[PDB]
């Protein structure tokens, strides 16, 4: 019924309800490190996540989510390919069923265990709603996740996952710090893209970080136990909720690093 990631409602079906699914700037895409090119005009990336603004954590049937207070500029994104200030409004995790898959964007065909997305909107549009209606309304920072050492900033979250196991559930969480999710390096690739889930609006400036972060298998496994389904329904594990790479058409992927 509702769009999804199954065989009967997965990505390859979306185009029937959202013709833009076959647009000219769809995400995610595969990053060919030796096709993408350094762009000397890109300014430095500014990830000012000083004042934490996390509010809720929830299961919306599509993925694990975190909502932030976007009333002020307490967590914004500036610099890089961006013109203006972009406000962080939410974050979600794309998880795989196996350690070898999960990420939406790929690097030279390589898939990661998962991909985190931090969504920000151009504060020049009044609100999120009017932003997505614009080509330069969104800025999504994508962060790759590989299995290994445990990520501290994720434990506290992983500890209360059972409180949002099924769709429609949510738990207050003012404890979430998007700083604890960032890798050491802020090198990235940027390209004009879209949302990776319906409506698939082509309103996104993508900033994918080259350096992945590590998470333990315990943390991963706990994320693989969320459910696509609601309470009192046949269990459907929330895994492989990622859209495969889309045609780059002839878009240019730029590197922030030489
Ligand atoms: Cu996403």
Swiss-Prot record:
Effect ascribed to mutating residue 60 to H: Reduced proton transfer
CDD domains: alpha_CA_I_II_III_XIII
EC number: 4.2.1.1, 4.2.1.69
Binding annotation for Zn(2+): 92, 94, 117
Residues with PTM Phosphoserine: 163, 170
One Gene Ontology CC term in the entry: cytoplasm
Effect of substituting residue 196 to A/C/H/P: Strongly reduced activity
Record annotation: effect of changing residue 140 to H: Impaired activity
Major location (coarse): cytoplasm
Enzyme class: lyase
Activity vs pH: Optimum pH is 6-8.
Result, substituting residue 60 to D: Strongly reduced activity
Catalytically driven reaction(s): hydrogencarbonate + H(+) = CO2 + H2O; urea = cyanamide + H2O
Cofactor(s) recorded in Swiss-Prot or TrEMBL: Zn(2+); Co(2+)
Effect on the protein of changing residue 62 to G: Impaired activity, not rescued by 4-methylimidazole (4-MI)
Subcellular location: Cytoplasm; Cell membrane
Impact when changing residue 65 to Q: 2-fold decrease in enzyme efficiency, as determined by kcat/KM ratio, and efficiently inhibited by chlorzolamide
Site feature Fine-tunes the proton-transfer properties of H-64, where: 5, 60, 65
Site positions per UniProt: Involved in the binding of some activators, including histamine and L-histidine: 90
Binding locations of substrate: 196-197
Miscellaneous notes: Target of drugs used in treatments against glaucoma disorder and breast cancer.
Family of the protein in this entry: Belongs to the alpha-carbonic anhydrase family.
Protein name, UniProt field: Carbonic anhydrase 2
The encoding gene: CA2
